[PDB]
Amino acid sequence: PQITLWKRPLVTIKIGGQLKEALLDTGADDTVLEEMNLPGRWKPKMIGGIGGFIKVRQYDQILIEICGHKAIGTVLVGPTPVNVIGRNLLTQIGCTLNF
Amino acid sequence: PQITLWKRPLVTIKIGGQLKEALLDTGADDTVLEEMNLPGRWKPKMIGGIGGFIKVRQYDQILIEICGHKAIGTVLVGPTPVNVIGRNLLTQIGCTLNF
């Protein structure tokens, strides 16, 4: 599909057996999701943007489905104000910018 | 052009007659550039990112060319970690997400 950018590019994702809403974010290197108690091990990480850094938990080899497109990769979990799908997963679903 | 996302979608922009590098950022509502000198009036504003809020200078109706495509819109100047082109200008140049 084609998503215009008049409004926030919000889509439904499936992760850890749950459905959530997330932004398709070409400015995000990594994927950052709201607090959720995913199973398994993790590693601490800090990520920075406008306003500074937040602390997140890095989970690897996580399965996510985005608009029926499956992907598997690293997900960062923490007190982010918004769920963002970053380039690590956008590439896997074949997402491009076009103008 | 069609831009894949294996690397950051960085492009050259021209603003205030000066060339800069900026990130096409579908997760940003607004366009935020690092500290620079711009001609014209401005108003102080606050914007919030992943780590908190920052103070910026709001310049309205600014000419800015993005990868060969002209826009005229609002540009925020302040302590952003990187120059980001937000949806307010991505829409002007006809940019969409596609997968």
Ligand SMILES: CCOP(=O)(COc1ccc(C[C@H](NC(=O)O[C@H]2CO[C@H]3OCC[C@H]32)[C@H](O)CN(C[C@@H](C)CC)S(=O)(=O)c2ccc3c(c2)OCO3)cc1)OCC
């Ligand atoms: C519920 C209240 O929300 P809120 O206002 C904040 O909400 C939002 C916060 C963040 C975003 C996404 C963020 N957009 C953003 O900053 O846009 C600004 C300007 O336009 C406005 O529109 C939305 C906010 C304003 C970028 O797309 C992506 N970022 C990096 C980018 C700056 C390049 C360095 S990143 O998120 O930091 C990030 C993601 C993955 C990573 C990483 C860093 O490093 C490793 O992987 C969207 C909405 O609370 C205030 C505390």
